């Protein structure tokens, strides 16, 4: 049992870092630009058997976009990740949502405000109102301090399977 996930956002807001943190564990510090796309499977164990997410790590830069919207074919779940420390990463969230809904019909989308371990936040939690508008799920996340680093996958597993009584029995 596995699903297909698309991880979108602006240029290196934390997507590759979050994927690497969840995959192996090590927090990569250098900013390495993603060349087109990265396919990294993530494994989780629940109380109803293990699952797998194929996280399509898309590129947030226009030069290295590659196929761009062509990675959204037959997507089953979506995570829109943006840097809290940069406001323009949040301002492009409706564009990524628009590109998601024009290729995906009825796919649940989870917002993720990444890198909240920084003491000063340019995008406050009050101002994040896009998840309210499109009935989306929002989590405050951080790949460095492990703040809610398993919550979005938990919500996506609960939504796709249909069992709210599902817990990561790690």
């Amino acid at each position: 049992v596995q699903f297909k996930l698309v991880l979108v956002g602006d240029g290196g807001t934390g997507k590759t870092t979050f994927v690497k943190r969840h995959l192996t564990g090590e927090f990569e510090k250098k900013y390495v630009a993603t060349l087109g796309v990265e396919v990294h499977p993530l494994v989780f164990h629940t109380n109803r058997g293990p699952i797998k997410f194929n996280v399509w790590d898309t590129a947030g830069q226009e030069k290295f976009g590659g196929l761009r919207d062509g990675y959204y074919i037959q997507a089953q779940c979506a995570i829109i990740m943006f840097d809290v420390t940069s406001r323009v990463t949040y301002k492009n969230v409706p564009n990524w949502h628009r590109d998601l809904v024009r290729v995906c019909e009825n796919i649940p989308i989870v917002l993720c405000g990444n890198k909240v371990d920084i003491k000063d936040r340019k995008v406050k939690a009050k101002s994040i109102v896009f998840h309210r508008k499109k009935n989306l799920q929002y989590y405050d996340i951080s790949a460095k301090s492990n703040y809610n680093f398993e919550k979005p996958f938990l919500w996506l597993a609960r939504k796709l399977i249909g069992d709210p009584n599902l817990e990561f029995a790690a």
């Binding site: 564990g25 510090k29 226009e62 196929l67 062509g70 940069s86 406001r87 499109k134 799920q137």
Partner: protein, 876 residues
């Protein structure tokens, strides 16, 4: 080979296969655009092709016809316009014939229609698309898929294109939308597509919305569509209502009264999660727009003008029906519910907080009887709803009114901290934390502070979800008591305060909370460390032996972390070891700023030994090398001039940190360490100054460097110059040349991302020049021969600050640093700086702006610069 094979290859999750397909598509696009686009259009229009290939070809045409960057989008549009008209005509014919042949629920060819239309319509080279779409939608013989695809294409066109192109023929577009949305449509999918198309086109039809009859027709059709038996159509119609109220709030006064209120109240009362969530979000959006209009009206009243838009207070008038419905929905829960589940209960709580912030004291009497009725309800759901409402109404009302209520309810909150229900305990701890945040004087009350502290230190042993808000309440209460301290004192620290009677017990319980094996859950260990750092930062001097014992415990824990380098076995043990390193180093940074100099003198040797061991463990490139640098910086700030003993051993690690530059945070931390070392050591950093200046020169140009790194480098250029005085003349010319090259560069002023970057860069340039002039001028004597080397650079410095003052964005820091630089140049050169300043009239305007500026330091520096200019004017 065949294009269909590559188009189907574009979806496989293989890296080499995807790269080969992407390279083939890129080469085909570069080699010959028109034949490639014709082949793509012929592939898309074929119904016999697979769905994946058709959508891939459609997205290929779209992303070869448009892009997110507006300049690249315009370039691609002009490139499409450069194509011969026959190939474009064939592509348009195939794309238009593709509509209605798609069994896919989202239309793929509609994106192609929008992308082609956004280029063709401003040239008016395709004057057949709108009549074709109108005749397709309005034809009763049209199929469901054809109507859906045409409506979706209409919505995409109206969203993507500029509104000043189809303004003349938008009436037929809205007629088609209304015809496709009405109740007589048999298929629900067509209604859903029509509502989504209207949702996209709501920003396009503003000129049509200005007309009264069309606005009335749209409102009537949307209100009719809100009553659809299908759930998704109701959700889409409610979203349309939300966007209408967001965009057209000035025209809802005629329609919200008799029509919208009952529909939205019935949506709120619905047991369906989506419809109730949409109604709650409708009223939350009403509150958001009303508070934005209130902010606008306040700003207009500060300017002595009427506001552009006047709110009519819909939520304030509808509070009487909003509050009981919200509180009734607040009773909907389950025994297994997360905090940020975003159910209608969480939405109702957020909407209650928004209503409180929007309506101030008008929400208190409508929600107090619910609390008084259900504060002792036998069912835990109603007590949970009562305490959640009491927590939510804290922010926004005047705290003087809330003080007797929270004083009365404080014993009940203490009892509910020991409630058998887990959710009631969680919400009670959340309410206590919000009490300590918003109304701090209620928490520090001599009647109930001791049972409150006992309940808090017992809740530190409770579940991690409780203990997170318990420690957050502890930190906020420590801040509140510290601000409530210093009764007379007139000192830098209070002698004693309210938590001094149990500070040792509190810090012991926090240290035991750190060692909880379940501290990984709900970020309990990080929250406990943050609470410990906040309470040791906000502590009095009578608790100092407890601070010293805590520092010794942290040092011993760091030494235990030192002794487990060979204990690294798995990845998800060494990453927790790295997290412990970061937390313990931040804890050391927080506790070392509070300890005395003499007491930290004995522990500084062991601290430096620990940091040197961690640097030896992280000698190769990076590893962490971030928290340890600021730990060394805090140790330097503690010690001062006695740090020079360890400088010889610290030289290679600082050299590695300066040579690395692959991480912006690590380089920034090393740069700040260099600045703090210069401040602490004065002229004792000269033997290392040549090496660190060579490293800074190597990292100066270095075009693959993050934007925030360079201003810090200029700031420590100024710091090094000010620290070493006249010894900077060895590299003064090269530093001045590179600073001139950096200051000559300028970025765009349109996007606001680089506005703060250019402000910080200019502030750092002025700081660097200020430090150079202050170093070369000496400290107490008259003008020096060292500043005569920078004498021809005064003209360029004043030209650069004239160019800065020409820009009108500004901040306080740039004007303050400019005034300091002007004063230093005046004191260093006399009448020449005054004459060159008088040559540029914008400098006086910038100084007047700085005197106008509310920052005390900036105004003081501007006044000092003006005084120096006046003294130079009166000199001769």
């Amino acid at each position: 080979m065949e294009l269909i094979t590559i188009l189907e290859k574009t979806v496989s999750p293989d890296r080499l296969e995807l790269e080969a397909a992407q390279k083939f598509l890129e080469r085909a696009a570069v080699e010959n655009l028109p034949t490639f686009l014709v082949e793509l259009s012929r592939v898309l229009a074929n119904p016999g092709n697979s769905q994946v290939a058709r959508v891939a070809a459609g997205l290929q045409i779209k992303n070869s016809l448009t892009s997110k960057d507006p300049d690249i989008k315009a370039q691609y549009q002009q490139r499409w316009l450069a194509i011969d008209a026959n190939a474009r005509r064939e592509v348009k014919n195939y794309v238009l014939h593709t509509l209605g042949t798609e069994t896919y629920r989202p239309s793929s060819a509609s994106q192609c229609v929008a992308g082609i239309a956004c280029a063709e319509i401003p040239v008016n080279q395709w004057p057949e698309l709108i009549p074709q779409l109108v005749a397709n939608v309005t034809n009763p013989n049209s199929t469901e898929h054809m109507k859906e695809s045409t409506l979706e294409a209409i919505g995409y066109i109206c969203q993507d294109i500029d509104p000043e192109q189809l303004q003349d023929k938008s009436n037929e577009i809205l007629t088609a939308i209304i015809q496709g949305m009405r109740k007589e449509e048999p298929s629900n999918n067509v209604k859903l597509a029509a509502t989504n198309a209207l949702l996209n086109s709501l920003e396009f039809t503003k000129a049509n919305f200005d007309k009264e009859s069309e606005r009335h027709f749209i409102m009537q059709v949307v209100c009719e569509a809100t009553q659809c038996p299908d759930t998704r159509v109701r959700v889409a119609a409610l979203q349309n209502l939300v966007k209408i109220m967001s965009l057209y709030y000035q025209y809802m006064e005629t329609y919200m009264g008799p029509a919208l209120f009952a529909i939205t109240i019935e949506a709120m009362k619905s047991d369906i999660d989506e419809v109730a969530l949409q109604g709650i979000e409708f009223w939350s959006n009403v509150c958001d727009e009303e508070m934005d209009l209130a902010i606008e009206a306040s700003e207009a009243a500060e300017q002595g003008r009427p506001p552009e838009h006047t709110s009519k207070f819909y939520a304030k008038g509808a509070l009487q029906y909003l509050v009981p419905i919200l509180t009734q929905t607040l009773t909907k829960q389950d025994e297994n519910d997360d905090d940020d589940d975003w159910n209608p209960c969480k939405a109702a709580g957020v909407c209650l907080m928004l209503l409180a912030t929007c309506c101030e004291d008008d929400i208190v009497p409508h929600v107090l009887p619910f609390i008084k009725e259900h504060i002792k309800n036998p069912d835990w759901r109603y007590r949970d709803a009562a305490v959640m409402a009491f927590g939510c109404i804290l922010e926004g009302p005047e705290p003087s009114q809330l003080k007797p209520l929270v004083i009365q309810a404080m014993p009940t909150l203490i009892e509910l901290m020991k409630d058998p229900s887990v959710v009631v305990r969680d919400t009670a701890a959340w309410t206590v934390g919000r009490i300590c945040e918003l109304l701090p004087e209620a928490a520090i009350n001599d009647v109930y502070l001791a049972p409150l502290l006992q309940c808090l230190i017992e809740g530190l042993s409770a579940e991690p979800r409780v203990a997170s808000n318990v420690c957050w309440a502890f930190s906020s209460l420590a801040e509140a008591a510290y601000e409530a301290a210093d009764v007379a004192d007139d000192q830098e620290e209070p002698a004693t305060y309210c938590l001094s009677s149990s500070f040792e017990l509190i810090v012991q319980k926090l240290l035991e909370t750190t060692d909880r094996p379940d501290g990984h859950q709900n970020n309990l260990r990080s929250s406990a460390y943050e609470s410990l750092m906040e309470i040791v930062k906000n502590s009095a001097k009578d608790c100092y032996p407890a601070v010293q014992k805590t520092t010794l415990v942290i040092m011993e824990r760091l030494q235990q972390v030192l002794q487990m380098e060979s204990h690294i076995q798995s990845t998800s043990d060494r990453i927790q070891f790295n997290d412990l390193q970061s937390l313990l180093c931040a804890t050391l940074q927080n506790v070392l700023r509070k300890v005395q100099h003499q007491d930290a003198l004995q522990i500084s040797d062991v601290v430096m030994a620990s940091l040197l061991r961690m640097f030896q463990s992280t000698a190769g490139s990076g590893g962490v090398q971030e928290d340890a640098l600021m730990a060394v910086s805090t140790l330097v700030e503690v010690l001062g001039g006695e740090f020079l003993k360890y400088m010889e051993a610290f030289k290679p690690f600082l050299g590695i940190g300066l040579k690395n530059y692959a991480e912006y945070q690590v380089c920034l931390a090393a740069v700040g360490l260099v600045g703090d070392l210069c401040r602490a050591l004065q002229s004792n950093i000269i033997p290392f100054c040549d090496e660190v200046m060579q490293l800074l020169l190597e990292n100066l140009g270095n075009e693959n460097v993050h934007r925030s790194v360079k201003p810090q480098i200029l700031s420590v250029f100024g710091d090094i110059a000010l620290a070493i005085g006249g010894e900077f003349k060895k590299y003064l010319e090269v530093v001045l040349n590179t600073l001139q090259q950096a200051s000559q560069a300028q970025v765009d002023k349109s996007d606001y991302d680089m506005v703060d970057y250019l402000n910080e860069l200019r502030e750092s340039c002025l700081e660097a020049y200020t430090g150079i002039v202050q170093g070369l001028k000496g400290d107490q004597e008259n003008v020096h021969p060292d500043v005569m080397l920078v004498q021809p650079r005064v003209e360029f410095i004043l030209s650069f600050i004239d160019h800065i003052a020409g820009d009108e964005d500004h901040t306080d820091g740039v004007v303050a640093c400019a005034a300091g630089l002007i004063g230093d140049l005046c004191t260093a050169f006399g009448k020449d700086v005054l004459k060159l300043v008088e040559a540029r009239p914008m400098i006086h305007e910038l100084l007047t702006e700085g005197r106008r500026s509310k920052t005390n330091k900036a105004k003081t520096l501007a006044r000092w610069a003006t005084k120096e200019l006046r003294k130079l004017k009166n000199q001769a």
